[PDB]
Structure formats: C-alpha cells, structure tokens
Amino acid sequence: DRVKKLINSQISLLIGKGLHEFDSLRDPEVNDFRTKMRQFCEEAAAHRQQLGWVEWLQYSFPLQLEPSARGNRALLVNVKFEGSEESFTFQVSTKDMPLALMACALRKKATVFRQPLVEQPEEYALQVNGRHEYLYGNYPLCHFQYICSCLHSGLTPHLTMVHSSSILAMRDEQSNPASLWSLEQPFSIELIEGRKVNADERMKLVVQAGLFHGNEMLCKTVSSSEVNVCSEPVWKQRLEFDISVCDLPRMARLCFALYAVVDCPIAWANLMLFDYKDQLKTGERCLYMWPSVLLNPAGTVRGNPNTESAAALVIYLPEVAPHPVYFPALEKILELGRHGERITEEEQLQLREILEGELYEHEKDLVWKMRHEVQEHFPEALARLLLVTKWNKHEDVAQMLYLLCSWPELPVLSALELLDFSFPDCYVGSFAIKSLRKLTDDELFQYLLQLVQVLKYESYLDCELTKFLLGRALANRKIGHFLFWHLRSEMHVPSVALRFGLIMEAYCRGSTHHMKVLMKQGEALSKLKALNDFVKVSSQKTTKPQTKEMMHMCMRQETYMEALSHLQSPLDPSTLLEEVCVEQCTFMDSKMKPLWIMYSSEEAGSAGNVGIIFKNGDDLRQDMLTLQMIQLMDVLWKQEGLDLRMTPYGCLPTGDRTGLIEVVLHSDTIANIQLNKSNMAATAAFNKDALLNWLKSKNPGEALDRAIEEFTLSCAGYCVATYVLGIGDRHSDNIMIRESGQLFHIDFGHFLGNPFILTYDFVHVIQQGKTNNSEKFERFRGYCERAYTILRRHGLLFLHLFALMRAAGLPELSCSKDIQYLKDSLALGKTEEEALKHFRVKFNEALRESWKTK
C-alpha cells in the first residue's frame, strides 16, 4: 500500500501520463492488458532475483562484442581491485582471455599482499573503469569493443576486479519490492449520423466505407448519398458489402472516410469487426474521427482521444445471430483446412522460376495449386503464397492456416518480411515472432527501432510482439533502456500514447530499479528543456558570450547541478554522465540554439570526458534512422573483414521535437578547418592543402600516414553510405573530421534522394598531397567497390527494414516511391556484374563533377 502508491506516482511521472487516465476509460481491453502484463512482468522480476551472478551480469551489463566476433599482438593493460587506490600495469596479448588477465592480477596482488589467495580468477569480473561495462566470458581480449577502441586510439585499458559478492550485493540493491461460417448474409451496417463536422456549406457530404485485411480490399468500397454540409449530418442509411459474414477474416477492419464534394477530405476512422476476445461486434458504436491531411486502412483502429473537438460518426453494427458469435478457434480452422487437394513436370519448373516481386493473375492460380510443393520445396516462399491467398474466402484461409501451422521456422530475414502490414493475419504474425525468437540480443537491438514501429500496425493491445519485446527488455537491461526511450519519445502522439504508455507501465512493474534510473534521466532532460528555453530567450536580446555566462549561472543552481549530474546516458546506458563541466558547456548559433553539455569522470579518466547535445525544436527521428543504417553498414562490413573506420554516433529522440546527440570529441567541420584562420598551425598557401595541413598538425611525423589511411577508409564508407541512402544537402559544415583522420557526416534531414558526391580537397588527402597518385586513389575506388557489393549481398535486409519504417510516419519515408531510391541505389533487380558496371559508371560520373573544381 505505502509503497504501491509511490511506485504508481513514480510510473505516472516517468511515462508522462497519470495511471488514473487509464482507469477513467473504464475499458475491459485496457484493464485485461494491465492485469495480464503486470503478472508477466512480475514473473520476470522474480526470475532475475534467482539468477546467478554471471547471468545477472549478462542482464545489467550485456557484452559489447566486435561484429566479427559475434556468432599474436602485445597489449598494455591497467588493473585495480574494487576499493584499492593502487593498480598494476602489465603486458597481455590480444589473444588472451579475461580469466588469464584476472589470474595474473590475482598473482600480482598475492605477491604484493605476501599471501597465497583463496579467491580464484573464476570468482571475478572485469569492470571497465567508471563505466557500466564489463569484460567476462571466454572471448579473447581483442573481441571486446572497449579493448578494440583502446588498441586503435592508442589508450591503455583501465579495468577493475569485481568479486562475485560485490556483483550479488549489487543485484540485491536493485531488487523489486515484496457459428460465423453458417452466416451467408452480406456484410451490412447503418450509417446513422455525423457530429461536430466542419466544412464548406456550398459543398455536400459523403461517407466512404471499405472492408480491409491489411491493405488488400476484402470487397468493393461503398459510398453513401450526398447530404448537405452541416455540424450534424443525418444519413440513417444501409451500406451492404459484396462479402458474406462467414467470409470475414479474424483481422477484418471496417474503414471510413468523411469528405466534402461539389474533392476535399475531412476525417478518417477505422475499427476491428471482432473485439480482443474474438466476439463479432454488435450495437451502436461512436467513431471519434481523426483529421485527414480516400480510405486509410493502415491508420489506427482506436478512436481520437480529443472527444470534445473531434468529429464523430455514429454507426449501428446489426445483430447477425440471436446468440454471441465468436471467430472459430484454431481447432475448428485446422479441421476445415486439413481436407483439400497431382502436378505436371512443366508446371513444376514454371513454379521453381516464379518462387526464385509482383506476379500475373494466372501465376497466382499456379502458386496456390502448388501450395504443398511451396511448403515442402520452397519454405522461404511463404510470403508470396500468403499474398496469393484469398483472405475473402474463409475456406482458402483455413487451407492456408493448415500449412502455416505445419510450416518450418524461417530465417530472421524472412520473419522480418512477415511483420509487414501486408501480412495482417494474427497466426502469420505469431509465426513470424516464433521465427524471430532466435534473434540474439545484438541482432534484436539492431532491428529494435523497426519492431517498435510494427507495434503501431497492431490491432489489439495484447499481442505476441508486445509479449516478445517485453520479455526481451526485462531479460536485457540495454534492450529495456532503448525500448523505454523509443516508446517514451512518442507519448505526445495521441494515436500511440495509450499502447506505448501501458507498455512502459508493464516494464516498470518488472523493473522498479530501472524505472528509478530512467526517472533520474527524465529529470535531467526536464532541466535541459528549461535551460534551452532560457538560452533561446536570453540570446535574442544579449550577445553569445553574455548568454553563455548566464547559462553557466543557471546550471550552477542546486536543482540543476543535482539533476544534470550522476546519470546514465540515455544515448548509451554503459556511459555514466558524472560531473558536468559547466565552463565547457555552450550552445549553437542555429534557430533552436542546441545546448552542448560536457561531462567528466574522476573514475573513468579520458573515457569519462563525454559531451551531449540537447536539441529542442527539431525532430530527430530521421537522423536516428540514418545513423542506425550507417551503423548496420559498418557491422555488415566488419563481418566481411572490412573496417572502414565509421563514426555512427548516438542520436536519440526523447520527447516532443526533443532529443540528444552524441558529441564526437576531437573533431571539427570541414568549414572551420577550411576557414584557414591566421595564427594557427594548419595555415595553407592553397585551400586544397588546409585539410592535409590540419591532419599533419594533429598527427606528427610517422602518425600522418595512419591519419591519411583513417581518412581514405572513412571517406570510402561515407561515399557509399550517402549514395546508397540518398543523403543530400551536403555542405562543408555538415561533413566533420576527427583528429585521428576519420571523416564523418552529420545532420541527416534529407535522405532517399530528397548523384554520387566526391571533393578534390578529399582527393588531395587520399593522394598524400600529390597531384597524380592513382595508386592511392584507385585503392580508395576499390574500398568503395568492396563496400558497395557487401551492401548489395544484404540489400534485402535494408529493404525489409526500410519497409517496416513506413509505420514511423516520416514525411520522407511513408509510401513505396521512397523505398524505390534504395531499389535503384542497391540495383537489386540486376546481377553483380551489371550492378558493379553501374557503380563504376556512377563513381566515374561523380568524378567528372569533382574534376570541374580541379
């Protein structure tokens, strides 16, 4: 009671909506989800408290492995023991494992402390200093991301020996407290009246209604008659559809569109015909309509929360039978689908050709006929077969479901295709999730953004995907972190606020301690929004140095100092944002005046000096998606042994036009480097030299050659990344360069088209200052070609991922026309020889554009 009230109030604070609002709906579906999902999440919390210390480290601190390790050299390492000021620096090998490194630190300590130790290397874990990152398991040292980062950046790994007891004590501190088929009658409804309708009185009103199974129409759309435009239009008419009640699939949805004709749309609303308990809906239903910007089947099946302002459409769902009618159970379906129906040698080859991607009408009749041959010989062709199935014929669906339920578990790639709205069947969705269960946390984390979007196409609150995502978030603290932030950022959207809000409440019941951690993070973002508003005002009246000192005063207050300090980074929970360095903080000159908040850690040293950018006024969803795609490219390339020294820095929308960006330290823009400022080391005689002179100055003597190599490699990666992804609006200010030579792009507002790019100032670097250096240039051309063909081998993965992101609601990613850019860029409808010929020609075409500068 005393703690139940507090947990509830903290959840309300955290999710940005009171739990009383949930109960105010007096909604069975909402109530049944809450009860069932609190129970499922409490079971998770209990499982966690009975984990072993290593399994608990796998929960709180999942391993950060190098892409090539997933599925020799000398190394200087610094080790200390938790509580001790003293440390040991020793030589290890990249091929050595943490148990060898621990056994070694236990020897040094045993000789310094003069006694043979009882403790064994198996009782310890290696914490990365001042980070929520550990090194454990039987993986050689080079396979860990931290060790790799260190090896490249020339820094010494600083590790701490954590005893199992310390980890177990840590666990306890973080513990939770204690029949349809007989009805041949056509589908009919009554369009009674409209309410709160606003439109031109010169025009007339009409209602268009259509029956959908996803996108595919179940029958012809039906329109009402033309009534006069007013606030309350009264139709009181019948709309009969050319489909029998028996043929209604489980996931059938009635779609409405209210518009004004002489063509202007007013509003849209849809609903499921069967409720969450599989009962066919009857009685009077009020559809609180959403504004239209003519049917929208993809749109949500829940009403517009703004009941006061919104237009309403009152409909009557007629009583079909004297008793309640439920959708048949799987047992009745697999019974009807069991009984069905030889094939010819030539039609067996015609099939092998069209299963190896739209088809003609006669081929559908062939893929349907050979459905058992599809299951047995081409199991990966499920999706094409599912698209030739008539979801308007109840026996054809029964036949399909009989095969799906015997169908083997598909690879992840195929299962991702099945999450598309094009496959709205629930037994199809459950099958897809069943085939995704084999995703590792690293694969899961990679596609997590796309899976949160898929949640928006869901017709009900209680689903296998919510159960899947919830179970995985509670079993891995990093997944839980990012599932929380993807949902939390979309709370300002009334169409997803209910589902996302209820999901986040469930997670919180399963993770009280993590709710407290995320509360600390929201508390910091609250102060930043308030510091940003002050900065936005102050800067329009006073000068930038003055506004900066005023920002520093405002930050120095008790509430600001406590909120902004000692939190886990929402960009990386492994990164602890410790001590805010007030003197180093500032903001950009742009419209939104984004804040640059700088942090330091006494515990983490060099690695604790981090920077975050708080942005308010701009939508950061497309930046995040692009950066995630660049990250995917990098993983894909590293898996094929290619490290193109990419910088896919963190970017996280946190709320309404609000987000954080990861500051890449020790980097500058080409614009600032090119400014060729006097009384600087880099001062060039010719602007073509500025970039190379800046590189020379940050990398003395022997180091310059490696910086030129870091530049070339990262240049090859971004040339391909921006080409494949259609990144435009490229200027010297949104192309950055790191002190180590790595080139990277920022600010991804325009992608998917909205020609390949090459600059002679980059070519000068690649060529080591030499005017003619085709040895070095062509090495770069080959880096592009190898990178491009690795991406094409995975072209389907980019397509399936981008397809799922149509649910996100991005204006530059909403229809098929957008994904055509990727189809063209990855030239997937061609052979590798025909695509590589096209890459070479586009690289040569981008070169002839560059040569105009030279």
Ligand SMILES: COc1ncc(C2=CCOCC2)cc1NS(=O)(=O)c1cn(Cc2ccccc2)c(C)n1
């Ligand atoms: C989407 O917007 C952003 N995306 C990424 C960044 C990052 C900056 C550095 O670390 C990597 C991430 C920053 C922003 N937003 S902004 O308003 O700060 C910004 C700064 N700049 C040029 C600039 C950069 C650095 C130093 C001086 C000036 C531009 C063009 N935008």
